[PDB]
Design a protein around this nucleic acid. Structure first.
Ligand SMILES: Nc1ncnc2c1ncn2[C@@H]1O[C@H](COP(=O)(O)OP(=O)(O)OP(=O)(O)O)[C@@H](O)[C@H]1O
Ligand SMILES: Nc1ncnc2c1ncn2[C@@H]1O[C@H](COP(=O)(O)OP(=O)(O)OP(=O)(O)O)[C@@H](O)[C@H]1O
Ligand SMILES: [Mg+2]
Ligand SMILES: [Mg+2]
Lengths: 372, 56, 290, 401
DNA sequence: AGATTTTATGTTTAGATCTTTTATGCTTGCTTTT
DNA sequence: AAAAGCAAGCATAAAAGATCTAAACATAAAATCT
């Protein structure tokens, strides 16, 4: 309906046609595909980078080009979708409609090699999320990357991954032969101005540019590009600003107060309070931070006795510490017996004191050295 | 490099009709192969006979 | 070679010469065919690589016989892979049984059923990276015992016959042959079995807050000539480089993945964060970041 | 033949019926007022409108109504400690949206739901989501392929589909393929999926999900805080209606002693039912405060001092000597040999003889089966290690006072 | 309208993995007899 | 003074111990041959 719901729809975070931030990367990928088409030679490639930087958007944009539709046979395989690491050849056969004698992965591999030896068109095999193909012996990944070096094969394959060094660390054996190792392409995380240009593209495709003044866009991109640089979190906070402003106001451009509030937002039971205070006391008073559940409960019972309030039994105390564990304040390393489980504090005490919000009690527990 | 040198496989079948006397006829019909096979069969059978008669 | 124990108790023209050596070893081949016909197996024990020599024997002489080449210098081959290769491709008998000696019993039965179907077996580096256990050598000796199967093999390691006892060395009916080519070990050492620049290349890909966290560890390391985790946590919360503890643990997990930082736990439970690079190069790196 | 039954089950053509009672259920008018409170206080009776969860209702309702009307799809992650009204609020929002779509005030939408603890395997969710669509039971590979054919391919008129996913941490595993598929399907434009994920831990996407899975899960999130002293009283007094069968101080004591422990609402609705059952056997018709005190002492039980007082005299000598060896050697883990020597000392003091060590191992095995102590298998006698599971002061409190 | 491989599927057990923890061993740094 | 000898210290690694997973094995649905 209105501009708020229009901007909330258009921020989308789905597939797109225009990619303002990735232009030199698209030109480099087009030059790679074009020179390996004109030379009619095979060529492996490994694109990588942090999640949300837009690798799959670039390759989905380049698998819809009409001229590459004329010149080469596109195949896109998402490697999470296969049932197993060795099953991917079978999926590749279904992407090529190859006839197979069937029901073993070896004959599917021989059918793929027999297709590659006498293919009429160049093959572009994009294997999205190739980190799922890594195992231990890694027969499948080496068998896939050995295909460009096969005699007469015309495959040129692209492997998308989040790891900067998956190619070297996971495929050291391809370094020995320079014809085999993939050309590497990083996708750097988005800068501040690139996120501003992505926002100014998405809000001008629907002409809802006016709901975001430039100052608050340059606050939002300055936070997101400094934290992580993925455009998914940027579009998520940009959608969340409008869907909070719609809930709050019911054209008003969003002010810096709303984006600052959602950015500072994004970026107790009494027995749980007594447990956290006794854990802070035992961690402060003692050099040995190997605290067991029983060693903590024996101090917690004395603290509850000196406070003249009833203490929980060990069977309920274990569930209390497990409920405190869900907040992230603690981490319990499990052992053979419930008494032997090791509590480990994961907040500093300056955060625990501000989280408990009962300073008159923590001043009493932390001054109670004699109950340890 | 060589097709036998692969990054993935470790064993390389070169099957030629195996289902489920290496020398040609020039060597087997040579007299020296005949006398060698005769002397070897005689010596091996005599040694096997001695081993059986000692174990009996 | 008669070594003295006191060393333990006190502890161009070359191409033509190598081609003449290779032509002599190529001239040896019919004698190897007769020796393999008599039941002996061939073993080569020269200095240099013998890959091209056994490939020439497979190419020029065994051009029509059934042949299973086995690359023993492969880091990742298994004896199950070789027994599965014989059982599935030579005999069409399907997958071999999971016990390898049961697979050798099956191969002995199926090869007893077919006389004059000889299987040549070429093993470059019988002392291979995954064949150095006693069990794989027992499987190879039980396979070489078969009258149908003939075996050629290469040897490179000096300590190879320590795993051949007299039973294996009797099953391996070896005819030793000094095939000393002088070729370099290219293919045998090409595999996986045998830095400030990389730190800059991974530092370029990091975001601004990760650059600030690593610069904090670099400043503490150059200031102290491994930092406890609590000082890095308080410095990041003061510099607003992190939202909470768990994001800092995720950043240090990424640094452990990219090997910029080694984590050494203390007896007190605190986590120490060493940077595994000498301090002169670290001071040059800090000067590079300014 | 059984195969026709299994084929009619896997095709969904026979509904799984359960056997009905021979006798009719009793009429509502024969019930006592205390029985009426006992059945209104059952945890299974969800109220039509939940007290003290209005803000979270507006949050989930605004998110789901915007995702349905915009026809875009997306994802949400709600989280909180158990019993805090998560799944009841999400199903209440979805029932309100279905009541609104029935009257054509909203676009219509499908409502799939799964739960991660009803699945034996993480991949079996593919079997179940398809079972909420077609109703056929198929293998997980064919179900995953048919779900990808449904979601990746634009097929107008596609309707919006809301996939509630309870118990998200069980679906994880090491590969995290299932949760990656469930969070990756909304990102495609062809699928109008709006997946909501319920879980307990606040920090789950950062603690155990992968970085791309956390990036797909997004930054829209909601946390259900534990019920306080007052909200637990409002819940129980809403469940009781206008009835005065509960004293107000009794509900106040139930809420005050339940909110101090966990903030679970099921604990309050169970303690009030036990208080009603306690008041029923006293032949009173009002749940006075001492019935609540008895039900609280029963359901927050601490019966280990009773176990040490109920032990046989040689087991009490054993429980004294284990704590004596812990005080003597300092370390908390004692071998059976020094425990037996302290046993002989204490038995020489008290004047009774002690059983020989082959019977003392039977005493140690009984205390280790009762979990008063932790102890090893008895095959390594005299060198087995004996942790004390009960606290050392509880033994003196049992055997003195 | 009934028997036979054929194939797709589920279970189980052996092996890969994560993690803690413990130890001999590889090297160091003095240390001390000939 | 030279080179063999005892505490010290981090480190690969070795047990282990739970734990999760991949492939081998038993088994059921089903086209296929009669
Ligand atoms: N340069 C860009 N301009 C506009 N939108 C973009 C750009 N890059 C990415 N996006 C948006 O971000 C969304 C996610 O990008 P994409 O899925 O390609 O990242 P990714 O690297 O594949 O993530 P992951 O590594 O987790 O798979 C896309 O749907 C797209 O709409
Ligand atoms: N605010 C409330 N008002 C009334 N009843 C409530 C409220 N919160 C919880 N309950 C009761 O307690 C029960 C809680 O069930 P619910 O499914 O909400 O728990 P949950 O938070 O999903 O638990 P888990 O996280 O363990 O799945 C409901 O059946 C409901 O009857
Ligand atoms: Mg992607
Ligand atoms: Mg629930």
């Amino acid at each position: 309906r209105n501009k708020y719901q229009n901007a909330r729809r258009v921020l989308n975070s789905a597939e797109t046609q225009n990619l303002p931030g990735r232009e030199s990367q698209l030109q480099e990928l087009r030059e790679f595909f074009s020179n390996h088409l004109e030379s009619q030679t095979s060529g492996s490639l490994y694109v990588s980078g942090q999640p949300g930087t837009g690798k799959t958007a670039c390759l989905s944009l380049l698998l819809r080009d009409p001229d590459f539709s004329k010149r080469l046979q596109r195949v896109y395989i998402n490697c999470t979708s296969i049932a197993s690491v060795g099953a991917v050849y079978k999926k590749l056969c279904t992407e090529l409609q190859l006839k197979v004698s069937g029901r073993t992965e070896r004959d599917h591999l021989e059918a793929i090699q027999r297709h590659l030896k006498t293919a009429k068109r160049m093959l572009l095999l994009v294997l999205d999320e190739i980190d799922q193909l890594c195992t231990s012996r890694q027969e499948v990944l080496y068998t896939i990357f050995e295909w460009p070096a096969l005699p007469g094969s015309r495959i040129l394959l692209v492997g998308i991954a989040n790891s900067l060094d998956l190619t070297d660390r996971a495929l050291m054996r391809l370094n020995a032969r320079c014809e085999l190792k993939p050309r590497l392409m990083h996708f750097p995380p988005y800068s501040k101005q690139q996120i501003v240009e992505i926002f100014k593209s998405r809000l001008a495709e629907a002409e809802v540019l006016d709901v975001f003044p430039p100052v608050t866009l340059q606050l939002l991109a300055a936070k997101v590009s400094a934290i992580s640089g993925d455009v998914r979190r940027a579009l998520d906070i940009g959608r969340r600003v409008v869907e909070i402003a719609e809930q709050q106001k019911r054209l008003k451009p969003v002010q810096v107060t709303q984006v600052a509030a959602v950015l500072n937002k994004v970026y107790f039971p009494l027995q749980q309070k007594l447990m956290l205070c006794t854990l802070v006391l035992m961690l402060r008073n003692e050099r040995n931070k190997d605290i067991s559940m029983g060693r903590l409960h024996e101090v917690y019972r004395r603290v509850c006795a000196k406070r003249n309030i009833l203490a929980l039994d060990q069977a309920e105390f274990t569930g209390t510490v497990d409920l405190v564990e869900t907040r992230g304040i603690l981490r319990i390393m499990r052992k053979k017996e419930p008494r032997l489980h090791k509590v480990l504090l994961q907040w500093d005490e300056e955060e625990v004191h501000a989280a408990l919000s009962d300073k008159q009690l923590i001043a009493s527990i932390l001054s109670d050295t004699a109950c340890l | 490099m060589d097709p036998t040198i692969s990054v993935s496989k470790g064993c390389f079948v070169y099957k030629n009709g195996a289902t489920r006397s290496l020398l040609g006829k020039e060597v087997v019909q040579q007299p020296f192969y005949e006398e060698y096979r005769k002397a070897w069969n005689q010596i091996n059978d005599h040694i096997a006979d001695l081993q059986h008669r000692s174990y009996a | 070679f008669v070594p003295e124990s006191d060393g333990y108790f006190h502890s161009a023209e070359h191409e033509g010469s190598i081609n003449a050596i290779m032509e002599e070893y190529r001239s040896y081949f019919p004698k190897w065919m007769c020796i393999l016909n008599e039941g002996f197996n061939i073993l080569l024990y020269g200095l240099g690589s013998k890959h091209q020599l056994l490939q020439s024997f497979h190419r020029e002489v065994l051009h029509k016989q059934t042949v299973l080449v086995v690359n023993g210098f492969f880091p990742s081959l298994t004896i199950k892979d070789m027994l599965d290769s014989i059982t599935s491709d030579i005999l069409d008998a399907g997958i071999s049984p999971a016990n390898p000696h049961e697979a050798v019993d099956m191969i002995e039965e199926e090869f007893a059923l077919i006389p004059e179907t000889h299987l040549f077996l070429i093993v470059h580096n019988l002392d291979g990276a995954m064949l150095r256990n006693v069990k794989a050598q027992a499987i190879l000796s039980r396979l070489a015992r078969i009258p149908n199967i003939h075996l050629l093999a290469s040897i490179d390691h000096i300590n190879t016959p320590l795993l051949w006892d007299q039973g294996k060395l009797c099953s391996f009916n070896f005819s030793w042959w000094d095939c000393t080519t002088m070729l370099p070990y290219t293919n045998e050492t090409a595999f996986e079995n045998s830095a400030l620049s990389s730190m800059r290349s991974v530092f370029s890909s990091l975001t601004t807050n990760s650059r600030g966290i690593y610069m904090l560890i670099v400043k503490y390391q150059l200031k102290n000539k491994g930092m406890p985790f609590r000082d890095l946590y308080s410095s990041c919360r003061e510099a607003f480089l992190v939202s909470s503890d768990l994001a800092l643990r995720a950043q240090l997990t990424e640094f452990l993945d990219h090997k910029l930082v080694k984590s050494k736990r203390s007896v007190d439970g605190s986590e120490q964060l060493t940077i595994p690079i000498d301090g002169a190069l670290l001071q040059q790196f800090l000067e590079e970041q300014e | 033949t059984p195969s026709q039954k299994m084929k009619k089950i896997r095709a969904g053509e026979l509904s799984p019926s359960m056997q009905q009672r021979t006798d009719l259920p009793a009429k509502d008018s024969s019930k006592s007022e205390l029985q009426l409170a006992r059945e209104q206080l059952h945890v299974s009776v969800v109220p039509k409108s939940l007290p003290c969860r209005e803000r979270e209702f507006e949050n989930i309702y605004a998110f789901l109504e915007g995702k349905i009307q915009d026809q875009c799809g997306g994802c949400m992650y709600v989280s909180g400690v158990p019993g805090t009204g998560k799944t009841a609020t999400v199903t209440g929002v979805i029932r309100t949206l279905q009541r609104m779509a029935k009257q054509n005030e909203l676009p219509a939408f499908e409502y799939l739901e799964i739960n991660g603890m009803r699945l034996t395997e993480p991949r079996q969710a593919y079997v179940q989501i398809y079972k909420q669509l077609t109703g056929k039971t198929v293998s997980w590979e064919q179900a995953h392929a048919l779900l990808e054919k449904r979601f990746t391919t634009p097929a107008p008129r596609r309707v919006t589909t809301v996939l509630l996913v309870d118990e998200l941490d069980i679906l994880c595993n090491r590969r995290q393929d299932v949760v990656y598929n469930l969070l990756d399907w909304p990102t495609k434009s062809a699928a109008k999926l709006v997946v909501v994920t319920i879980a307990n831990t606040m920090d789950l996407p950062e603690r155990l999900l992968m970085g791309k899975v956390t990036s797909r899960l997004g930054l829209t999130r909601l946390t259900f805080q534990p019920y306080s002293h007052k909200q637990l009283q409002e819940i129980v007094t809403a469940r009781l209606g206008g009835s005065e069968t509960f004293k107000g101080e009794a509900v106040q004591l139930v809420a005050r002693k339940v909110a101090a422990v966990s903030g679970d609402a099921r604990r309050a609705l169970d303690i009030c039912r036990r208080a009603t059952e306690i008041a029923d056997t006293a032949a009173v018709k009002c749940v006075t405060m001492l019935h609540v005190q008895q039900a609280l002492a029963e359901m927050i039980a601490s019966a280990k001092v009773q176990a040490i007082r109920n032990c046989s005299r040689m087991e009490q000598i054993f429980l004294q000597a284990i704590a004596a060896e812990v005080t003597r050697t300092g370390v908390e883990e004692t071998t059976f040999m020094g425990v037996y020597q302290q046993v002989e000392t204490i038995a020489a003091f008290m004047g009774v003889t002690f059983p020989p060590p082959g019977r003392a191992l039977r005493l140690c095995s009984k205390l280790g089966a009762e979990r008063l102590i932790i102890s090893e298998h008895s095959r390594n006698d005299l060198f087995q290690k004996i942790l004390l599971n009960v606290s050392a002061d509880d033994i003196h409190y049992a055997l003195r006072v």
